[PDB]
RNA sequence: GAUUUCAUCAACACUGUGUCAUCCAUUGCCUUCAUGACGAACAAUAAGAAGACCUUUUUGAAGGGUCUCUUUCGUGAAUCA
């Protein structure tokens, strides 16, 4: 009866892990894409000049 | 199967298409393919010289190494049919 709840408790941990993965990947892609956008803006300015 | 934007939640990465610009320089503009023929040219492999050159030896003269031509084997080149 201890594991009756202890083994089920892992659902919160796994959902937290997956949500952390989603947030981390979204944030990293967002910042990297912003940096790429800035680099492309520098290229566009260079090409305009 | 679920779920951050539902391309990217990004005005980036792209996909395909259309348009435009751009030889850096050079070459050529299939009848590319076959047979037969020919002017000319070429050398790996090898050979053959009263033409010419250099070095060394004491010199006239001698030793060695070179330039030039030809041929065996052949070789591509391609004006035309």
A32 beta carbon to strand B: under 7 Å? no
Please give the backbone phi and psi of residue A8, each rounded to the nearest 5 degrees, phi first. Answer: -70, -25
Distances (CA, A) of A26 to A4, A22, A31, A35: 36, 6, 9, 14
Burial label for A10, CB within 10 Å (0-12, 13-18, 19+), is exposed
Q: How was this structure determined?
A: cryo-EM
A41 beta carbon to strand B: under 7 Å? yes
Distances (CA, A) of A27 to A16, A38, A42: 16, 17, 23
Return the SS3 of A42: helix
Compute the distance between CA of residue A36 and CA of residue A28 in angstroms, rounded to an integer.
12
Compute the distance between CA of residue A4 and CA of residue A6 in angstroms, rounded to an integer.
6
């Amino acid at each position: 009866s201890s594991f009756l709840d202890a083994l089920g408790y892992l659902g919160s941990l796994i959902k937290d892990f997956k949500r952390r993965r989603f947030f981390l990947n979204k944030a990293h892609q967002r910042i990297r894409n912003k940096l790429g956008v800035s680099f492309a803006e520098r290229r566009s300015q260079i090409v305009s000049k």
